[PDB]
């Protein structure tokens, strides 16, 4: 079409031509209200208006509620806690209602007023026309052939060698800052320096170190020594390795040491007093026949499957249970895993009492504690 | 591997699985149910449940294989 006859095309004809250029034919398009001046059109217009107006009023409610509602947290069982509890639900209600009503109004406008159409477009997919494929292939092949890189093997080999070497060097210098040896001896021990995974807070450090089983009071002095008579039969305790040289939480270094022993992943120990009427049922592990002090046994509180705290002690079944994957170990059979995905027994900590009578650890764990790895056993 | 009489819309999409895949699948599922009896558990009710389900699977596979081998099932 020329400028003169483009100047004399109606908008519908121009839309048809534009669609035809792009490959689109609108085979149906009709106004939504062919019959003028009906009450139904007024009703639909007012419905869309009401939805948009509800969106507007809910946005206004959002503004007002956000600015003026009492939002600050209120303590338990006090006045103003109901308004605080309603604070966030009111934000959600107003915001969601406003934007949802606006969306509903838009959908209704599309369905009721925008003319229904059925357009058809040609995909023009699959292979390109042979002219385009041949020209692009010729351009690429001409680049590669005029470059002459093919007939110069020394340059190509040198380029490959250099790019590969630079890439290897850059990748190594990139990843290498993250690579840490897990077996570098960094942990002191009464037998030299040892890897982290071989040691915990129960590992003695100067060959005769008194390590107390300390309960967590959960408070200044969060750990305290404890005596065997402080556990009633069928009772369970979570103890931690606490030494005299760790302090009582007053000085800042004391708090640092107490934090570092409370956060030790392999630190917590479950201490259980078997009822004597059941001590005949105890089966002892080879090499750990003398790790209990009478009725008190001590096991690791770290599951052997994936390291979660297996911290559910069922006294009437003497079953240690891990909530992460439902493993069950028998506390009467050296914490042997009787159920679940765990296949290794929990480590048993040797315990005794000192001169004053306070429960202490009688050595170290006779094996690695947490979940297994390649280098175990 | 099917006819229009068995799967009406056979020309329209993937509609046949070779019966070998199902037979070996049943045998392997039975073997897995059986091998799950080795592990850590005191009780033996679960062992009988595994044995019963494996028996049902092996019986189904055996019947299907026998009927295809004799001609009734195709």
């Amino acid at each position: 079409p020329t400028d003169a006859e483009l100047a004399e095309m109606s908008r519908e004809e121009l839309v048809k031509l534009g669609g035809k250029i792009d490959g689109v034919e609108t085979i149906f398009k009709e106004p939504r209200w062919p019959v003028p001046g009906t009450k139904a059109e007024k009703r639909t217009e007012r419905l869309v208006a009401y939805w948009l107006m509800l969106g507007g009023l809910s946005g206004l409610a959002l503004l007002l509620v956000f600015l003026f509602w009492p939002w600050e947290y209120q303590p338990f069982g006090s006045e103003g806690e109901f308004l605080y509890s309603l604070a966030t639900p009111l934000y959600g209600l107003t915001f969601g209602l406003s934007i949802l009503s606006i969306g509903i109004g838009a959908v209704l406008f599309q369905k009721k007023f925008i003319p229904e159409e059925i357009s058809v477009q040609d995909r023009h997919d699959g292979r390109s026309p042979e002219v385009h494929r041949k020209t692009v292939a010729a351009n690429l092949t001409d680049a590669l052939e005029g470059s002459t890189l093919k007939r110069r093997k020394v340059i190509g080999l040198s380029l490959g060698i250099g790019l590969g070497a630079f890439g290897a060097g850059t990748l190594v210098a990139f990843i290498g800052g993250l690579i840490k040896n897990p077996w570098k001896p960094v942990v002191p021990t009464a037998e030299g320096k040892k890897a982290v995974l071989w040691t915990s807070g129960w590992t003695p450090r100067f060959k005769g170190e008194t390590i107390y089983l300390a309960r967590a009071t959960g408070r200044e002095s969060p750990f305290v020594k404890m005596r065997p008579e402080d556990i009633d039969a069928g009772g369970m305790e979570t103890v931690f390795p606490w030494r005299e040289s760790d302090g009582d939480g007053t000085t800042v270094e004391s708090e640092h040491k107490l934090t570092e022993i409370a956060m030790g992943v392999r630190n917590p120990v479950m201490l259980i007093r078997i009822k004597p009427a059941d001590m005949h049922r105890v089966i002892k592990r080879k090499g750990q026949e003398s790790f209990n002090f009478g009725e008190l046994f001590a096991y690791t509180k770290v599951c052997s499957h994936l390291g979660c705290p297996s911290s559910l002690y069922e006294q009437q079944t003497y079953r240690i249970l891990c909530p992460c994957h439902q493993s069950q170990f028998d506390a009467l059979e050296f914490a042997k895993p009787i159920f679940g995905p765990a296949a290794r027994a929990l480590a048993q900590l040797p315990i005794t009492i000192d001169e004053d009578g306070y429960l202490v650890a009688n050595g170290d764990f006779v094996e690695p504690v947490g979940p297994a790895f390649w280098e175990r056993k | 591997g099917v006819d229009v009489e068995d799967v009406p819309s056979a020309e329209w999409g993937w509609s046949h699985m070779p019966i070998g895949v199902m037979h070996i699948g049943g045998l392997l599922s039975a073997a897995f149910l059986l091998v799950m009896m080795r592990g850590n558990h005191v009780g033996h009710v679960e062992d009988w449940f595994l044995i019963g389900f494996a028996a049902v699977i092996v019986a189904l596979v055996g019947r299907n294989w026998w009927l295809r081998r004799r001609g009734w099932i195709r």
Binding site: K207, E289, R344, I351, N362 | -
Partner: peptide, 28 residues
């Protein structure tokens, strides 16, 4: 999907073992 193996170092015992001795700690 294969079989299971018991840990080589997780056997039981029959020896009852001696009661632990009272603990004494070296000064350092």
């Amino acid at each position: 999907a294969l079989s299971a193996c018991s840990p080589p170092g997780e056997t039981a015992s029959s020896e009852p073992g001696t009661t632990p001795a009272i603990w004494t700690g070296s000064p350092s």
